[model samples]
Target chain A: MVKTIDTKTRVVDVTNEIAKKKYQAIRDFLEGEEFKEVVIFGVYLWGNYTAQMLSKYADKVYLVDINNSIKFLNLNEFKLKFIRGEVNPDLIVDLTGLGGIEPEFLAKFNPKVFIVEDPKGVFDVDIYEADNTYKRTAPFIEKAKVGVLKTYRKARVSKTSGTMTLTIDTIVDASREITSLDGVLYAIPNLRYYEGILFHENDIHKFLSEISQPAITISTLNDVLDEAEEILSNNINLIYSFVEEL
Target chain B: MVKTIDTKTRVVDVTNEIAKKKYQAIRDFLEGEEFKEVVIFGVYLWGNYTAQMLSKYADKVYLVDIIKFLNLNEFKLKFIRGEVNPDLIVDLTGLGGIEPEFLAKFNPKVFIVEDPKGVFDVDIYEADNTYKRTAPFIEKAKVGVLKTYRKARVSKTSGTMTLTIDTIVDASREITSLDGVLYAIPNLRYYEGILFHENDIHKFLSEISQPAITISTLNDVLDEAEEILSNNINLIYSFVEEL
Candidate 1:
């Protein structure tokens, strides 16, 4: 006689085996390290269990899929947010058909960690760590206590016949007191003379380009500039001299 | 300021327009001709409309798809059966992908009419009629009502022993009948004797091979054999002579 089982029972029997293998790899990874947030992409039948397991360890878990089949699952107990579209999150875990992430899309998130499940074996895990070159330069500035200051002043140019005029306003050290002779001198606004040091904004831009790092975004480069300014302000007097044409 | 729309709404709006175009093609085909049955192969979003429209004209509609994505609609009034696998219906009106009927699959039903919707234009239609060459040989057999008689008697041998003999199984009334008798004696159960037809079963297979036609399944060829048997039982005087 042929044996027959109910449809619901048959589905559970198949799902249990699939979940056990996937959970094995997940448990191993969670034991070694820790993650505060995670995003699970491509919620196929096996992915439901994977998301549930991640919810226990991570503070926040997000599950995303293009198809509406994800709604059928009842995973209310887990700290999981089911999103309908593609999104960027702190850590991306791709278990979809495309097995691997696109380079451009992956770069946008620049997530702390990325994981892809191997189709052949559930235990085989491929993990990628984000490069640190593109991080903000705020910490570097704090380490080197740098100061910055800006000032506006008036200076005198060549005196015409029976006419008094102040044309030059110079930037000198606060420690060095300004005298009347300094006011008559022409000031070059673009040129800043720091005690025994001279540099332009353009020079800073050039110097950073040749650093031979992995990569840096414009936002990060601007942060580096602010750090450079702070470092220059300490133990040095900046002098701004401007020349106005008569 | 910028205008913003929900992503879900945008997807549904685009899907609705696509569904409309697919329904338009389906509506035109049903209005033009009529069919008793139809077998729809692939069922994506558009296939739902095709099945609903075909259900109106055809007596029975079979909807087949690999995935179980068929949604229940108000068209349950029609005689529609959603099947999960590829199957052969008695009167197959193919409305899914391929328009024209396969010759072998077509011959089994020999349906009254076959219709195909032109993909380029919804208004255009393509129809195919079954060929007559592949039909049974019953008409030829009926033309001559052959008389075949058998006689059994006793004969004497040289040793004074007697042996029962069956003799003179004659098939006549046509000159072609003689050539048929010669063939019948050595028919070997594989070949059938038709008047003046001395060709073997191998010849029929060879002739069919030379004909330029597209592929067909074996299930259809077996159906053709059953059809030939039904057509052959008309007016032929089939006699059995045992020796």
Candidate 2:
């Protein structure tokens, strides 16, 4: 059966259930020492609560995701930083939405090690921001995860006072940029479904398998968050790392 | 000027002129003695005269085209068991004002190449010959080039036919592939003017480039013709020795 954790109401036992199910792998790597930090990748459902509880054994806590719903919760008592993950990473991620840490960025603060908390699958990376209108015609835009289309729709609806009426087919036929009204609606629908709880491990596993093979990189959550933060700080320098010396 | 060689009239010059002006690259390639056979790839213009003349000098001549004109001409000579070079390729020269090629069967012995030739640009290749059915849908028996939509109204007492339909567009939009029919009339009009000696090279090239890129491969032709032929054998296969 496809099971899921409800994000709205935090059940203590539900948090414990996920931790009991997922922590064995992390605990095996921890080897009894306290984890320096724990950055929850998808912080949806019981993920945030699990991260909050894991903080008891770890020095710091982090929520690596786009949703600000956790910030609205009383979890403010726990020391946590909501790290925004880039949709387009230079390296790939598995189904869990964990990115491979870029080496140059990882080297900046000499992190102990990094780990993919929710390692699951890989998707084609898109550089164009959800609101970037000119990038609508870019080839990468077509390969973009349907999530980008949803992002565009949300951004446009908010900007135009919610009067924007459009459809995906109209968006495709118009041949407009992703930043346009139609393009935005096209991308937003796809993006919103990305972290949907409707999907199961098998669903994610199938997606990861269909797209790319997954490799497990074992490490602590602190190193992963630090690496991600360092990478974000130098988005400009990140471009250089992508280019070959020659 | 655009020109056509009527096969009914013994005109080797039509084949010779087209070889000289339009197909210089192909003619030059065939001029060499090393190659036994050379396949020139292009649209209908490439098929005209080049294959016939090259056959005379070169060891084997294969005209690979989707133009049903060649097949009709070849079938017409089936009774004789032998025919002139002009008679061998009839469909290309037979502008007799009928779509008889639509119902004719071609011989497998004679080598005629089949390639994708579109009625017009922008329209994707339809799996079925939906593109050709435009005439039957419009309820018109036949159509011609340069006949504007205006002429379908005028009552002609005497001319080529009782219904002097001047252009393909003005007839009826109900059955026509709008993009194909629109483009075909203009494309044929420009081509016919030159064929009839009413236009020149500049006008022809300008018109040719405007349409979608023409299909130039025998494989592509077979793909489109397969809708009509329903089998792969609709194409010709021939062998040749080195010159």
Candidate 3:
């Protein structure tokens, strides 16, 4: 459950330099291969970081993600292209981790090379593409609870909407000063569920910290960035070795 | 999800005549079979309802459920027998549905549910009798979520989060939240899975109205009571009728 973001969580948006090493490792594998175009999935902190670094290896670097939270990141330095909505890539630089990509999807796309960090030793699969799309879109109408698939991150509660806007202590100004996508996503689903959510102010500091790292949080965001770095690099190395072995 | 109760829903606890039709249908079969003592499961609206009605047929009726919400009801209930008479030869009725709040929310210190001349614990026993036929179809259907218990159902009521309910009645479509007793149990994996076929997966199941809407009305309560009892009666006699 995404909770309302507080000011304490957004105080400083600083990221550590530990994430660079993983990017450096992937670059090592990239230096040798001459692909026409390189595409990356996951456009969060590491995804954007990847797109930034992939410039030297491929002629064009394309980035894909469900949302445009990465827009907060200023990328004037790099010539990266955003593949909006639908562009199913052939060789997957899958960053969503192992189970994130479906097995039926694996059968459908048939990605000859898929690099992912698997806990139970790196392995592969998808419901095709429509699974996530259905989850994202189909919530508008009433849905009978059928084979509930991968319901971990999906919000159980929904946002409130109506004809009239009403709330006690209805201070028009003090109510909403939320800026970050994190704050928004957290706030929207949770307003009705938890009673006393002190909807805090000043999100840009954390939002800037996040998109720049462009990690999810400034606190653990740097740690995850560095962690994502190692896994991405390590997985890339394993796939590179395996591919050459084949 | 346990929101404040509304008066409109409580205006009249008028149960359906159809519910009586179901409870009576079960009694028709019970009239033929003789049990020394009967043990019933559950204690909420239906469980207590089963216990109350069973007094005429059995010498004594025992109710088993996670909670004992009603000590007595509109039907003057008998003394709840704590000691399980191992001399038991009675038919067991297990009335179960995961009502997360109000009555079904067991304080969970002790107590569960029963055996009687009433509804067989349909979710467990029916699945038990028909597991061979249903399990394969569910696997084919790939109702994976319903086929396995991969996560823990967080218990707001218990000191411990896990409630080890061995069985559950599988009227899954009525479920509104994860707060229910059956949501977390291991046996619940087999609960919803065995009830459906491959084609019905998408066509029948997909939409949910609101997280707050549940079987909250008295008629709704009675409707579940009679329907499940009817299932218990019809299924048990089908073995005598043909098997």
Candidate 4:
């Protein structure tokens, strides 16, 4: 087991060799052997070091943060492009910690994979297949990242601290920590639930194994409800807009 | 089983008393013990006789058709207003059948309900002497919406609900409230159509379209709109090429 790096106090690269090894493992698993881009959010320590390991394989490595003190840690030798950014990224190493980035905002870019350091905030997971759209209702509290590797035809259902991979037989072959024998309502918020009912799951479990077609084709409406369905009413006015085929 | 009327060649009200007896069932089930606004299409015998029964309860009994020569069947015994010159056309199921793309939306799970004798809208006027029977006078049209169906999927976005069907329905039908949508052409059958995965069409449509849809579900459907099919197919297909 790779030791969890405490980026709360110091930079990930400047930490002990153990944390560095952990970051390296994460960087490889996320970026794989080679990649076109890598973006990280903190600027000081973890952001700097994350930039270091990832800079080797990435053609474009960006450090996105609100840190105006870029001159203080002025490393004249190596330059990093720090960005201020509802970021739409393919890959991100966000160690910026807690409330800085809203989980609801990040859910908009339902990327193939996403990693988060903070175990707080409501993180809605949506996975898509040819016909159906799958969703998971769990907190990002665990040291985990949900990554779908379609190339390998596998999905990592990580409700635990350890990385557990599963074969994607149906839409999204994913499950959550289940406690009850009966199924848990798909109630997470942006996570559509059943009959306003909610439950707790103990071990890893999966759902919606029937039809494979996605229920929600409208993502804009999907984004609206995920953030404010409760503030108003749970009804949506219909808007059938033409999506340009790419 | 209710008797199917033969409104093709002769008049409906002038129907052989045997055929006239069959009309009572639909009249009773449709209007119930009491009612309000009931609109009947076609202005011939069935149109005359249908108006006869429905007129008893309806506050607004309207018989819509293109019968310009009202004097030919004139029975001044009962005054019937037959007007002319209204430049509007319809094309829902009865008139234009159904849309393939509309059906294509439910592509993966293809289910089609065949109303063999369904209503098809007629526009072009032919001076032909033989009135080649007006396709069973909404026979399939009446039966189609008369069933229990739940095909349309509704979208829910906090109190404001949206439907994935077609926006054209609102503009063509002049109905902003989806309340009456349950009676949509899809909600006609009593049971057994292409897709019957859902039996409780009301609760189902009620949910998606619900605290999502307007408080109106096609609870009593063909029991509701013998009009929507004719109207929809008519309204849906406003353009034609019958040269």
Candidate 5:
């Protein structure tokens, strides 16, 4: 049975749930592969389970943390190194939450590949399914309120005066208006349905053309939870299958 | 007649003397050419004459000094702006003792060429005879002593251990050696004559192959003075003619 959590605890609860699934998938993928001398390093957020899991497959596993909170765990069959400082490793799983991994540290090892959340925007690596899964699970939470997501599809700004004229994509309960010193516009529509709220990657490119600065397109309430549920419903083993191909 | 100063005052004296000669050359060059609007900026070591010479041709001239002790000169015809802070300028003539012009400031307005002492080794610019002329004047000063200039002709280090084997160039009266923790050598030969001291541009590239670090070449003693004499003997108007 699918369980539901309060809106306040939704992000935290969903993230942990997704991470646990990804961990299991990684274990299955590594077990099938024939790696003679595998060395792996996991960075930030993949709890003691990651160390315990990788220790089975890898000859040497160095679990590095900057926070210094990670304590040594006793495993009978395999041993894992708990390092307090930075290190260069063969495979790096970065859940560091610092937007992306440090470039200086990454350059030294020049690892085979990085596994990250939002790899398209944040990093130059593969996008773990956890983020896409979060998108699907977001809408069920109580705090998933109807908010405006602006994607400047067929939007144009006047060259003479920097005023934007866009075809409003969403439906709003109240009269939507954006006011500046130069001008103001009224009666904008808001996205009514869950599907109408979602925008393609190409929409973001066109939006950037009209607006010089980046405007927030995706939201935690609408986009993240919706996509998370979508992936979970369609294919829970999508990310694990990707690992097998790699 | 070539005037000589005491060796104690040689560097300072010849520097001024060469400045005077360069001033005259610039004046003659400007008079021959027809420049509608010429803007020139000179950095470091050109006494009051640089201000006076540039004032003749250039519409506006900015004389910048970090020292902050330049006494204002009273000029009737043209006025030269004395700037204390950093500025972007065209035609940067660096007589400054700094090996290279301040790169940050130099990059803003990268001029066609820099007029420097040794173009072969120092910068990728045309060799102005005025700097070569100053080199000749330098030797007449008594303080111009026999100093050894080291250029690593050929060098190799072992891959296992960084032990260097090198062939040293140039002359010195006493046995000079550079010792590192790895190894040491003895009885290095020094170039005895004045002309043997000066090396061409190719020597720097070959020297770079042997040594990782940069070393100073071209001294105020022999090479500068000899080149100065060469320029004067061949053509007094050599710099202006070359321009």
Candidate 6:
């Protein structure tokens, strides 16, 4: 309902207790958390505001707006140090590896054995089919702060493990004469160690639900970054104890 | 059913019987009737083909394409001509008073108007709540091109043109600020006498159906051109009469 207030000759209480409660909730969460470094992947309206709030606490906040409107006025208030213009999600994984962040994290958890469930399905079916690239791929590549191709490829291998499934319908109907073999290319760098599983759309959605509530992975990349920071700090502390003798 | 044929493949047993039948139809029409001119509008593939076929039989064929593209082949196609660009549909009605062609065809026995009726409805309820300007408008303008603006104004005038009618709730709600004003002051030149009728959508749809299909005030301009040609023919006849 739209409430029209015409306070011409009288004073009406303009207090917003509900708005105050919402602001306090956000402020409490910010004060409660301690993250040394935060990397935000997507730049939705709320994500931008959260990044702004997190910047007050975190040591360095990286901003990536894949839609390529970085110089837009709304983002001007928060001076984001690391910005990848027109960067996509896969590009985020690539940059992490390049900066030795992924390698350092992986080294600490060497015996833990991180397994990518189905590499091929993740890259081809999910990432490639996503609308982000088709609608804005060219503009994204052109405006990216970092060169995207190498980073994107590296990210694809690390994340997907190159487990691509090909159905007959997808091959015959979608592929025309001029389509490149890159679509079905075995891009997973270390597929030998990881087992590949294939599932249909229903199976995938069911598997998504089977995951934990407060649903960690499906949450925004900022939440993912927060978890990564916590894990990294703990891993560093663990490695310090072992390296004390070495 | 979808059929797949290789680029180099050819189907056999196809004959000239189809061509012969088409020729018979043409021959029958030509010998059976005496007609003056045939006008074709719109630049889409189907319309272009229709114009091309009509050009063969009509005494005077006027082919108009609203949207312009680079025509690589013919710089000298006599029948093809530029039309009032779709952006200026309202402008076409404005030019009716000034253009000599409009003056000549001001009153024709039959006038026909064709437009997509749902387009203005779509425009009113679009997420932006305002009708799109320029290209999309130009494309949709072909359908009831003049009526597009009229429908938009009428919808806007009535307070019923909310974005939520067909779609999810839009962030902004637009209310009719003006009492009955239709076109913007700048675009007022595009329309004729404005009708702010207190009628529902169904009634307005019926009201617009009264006009003739294709020929309207624009045809008056063509009529003026015909009169000029007739004057020339008369002058030639006078010369021949002396002979």
Kindly report, for each predicted structure in the order presented, the TM-score of its chain A compared with the true chain A. Answer: 0.35, 0.29, 0.36, 0.34, 0.32, 0.20
Instruction: Determine which window of 10 residues in candidate 4 chain A has minimal summed lDDT.
Output: A162-171
Which stretches in model 5 have alpha-carbon errors above 4 Å?
Answer: A1-16, A28-48, A66-90, A110-118, A121-241, A244-246, B1-243
Tens digits of per-residue lDDT for model 2, A100-193: 2223332222223233332211111221111222222122223422111011122121111000111111111121122121101111111011
Query: What residue runs in model 6 are displaced by over 4 Å at the alpha carbon?
Result: A1-28, A31-34, A41-53, A62-246, B1-36, B40-53, B56-60, B64-112, B115-243
Interface RMSD of each: 57.5, 27.5, 22.2, 25.1, 37.7, 30.4
Report fnat for all candidates as fractions from 0 to 1: 0.00, 0.00, 0.00, 0.00, 0.00, 0.00
In Å, residue B27's CA in model 1 sits off its true spot by: 44
Worst 10 residues of 4 chain B by lDDT: B155-164
Per-residue C-alpha lDDT of model 4 across residues B154-241, encoded as one tens digit per residue: 1111000111122212221222122222111111111111123345655433323221011112123222233332333232211111
Query: Residue B219, candidate 6: how far off, in angstroms?
Result: 53
Q: Show model 2 residue runs off by greater than 4 Å.
A: A1-19, A35-38, A67-107, A117-246, B1-243
TM-score between predicted and true chain B, model 1: 0.28
Model 5, position B103, has a per-residue lDDT of 26
Residue B201 CA displacement from its true place in model 2, Å: 72
Q: List residue ranges in candidate 4 displaced over 4 A.
A: A1-246, B1-164, B168-197, B201-243
For this target, which candidate reaches the highest lDDT against the unseen true structure?
Answer: 1
lDDT of 1 by residue, A119-206 (tens): 2111111111111211221222333211111111223111110000001111111101111111111000111111002132345443
lDDT, each prediction: 0.27, 0.25, 0.26, 0.26, 0.27, 0.22
lDDT of 1 at B199: 50
* Residue A33, candidate 1: C-alpha displacement in angstroms: 3.5
Full-model lDDT, candidate 4: 0.26
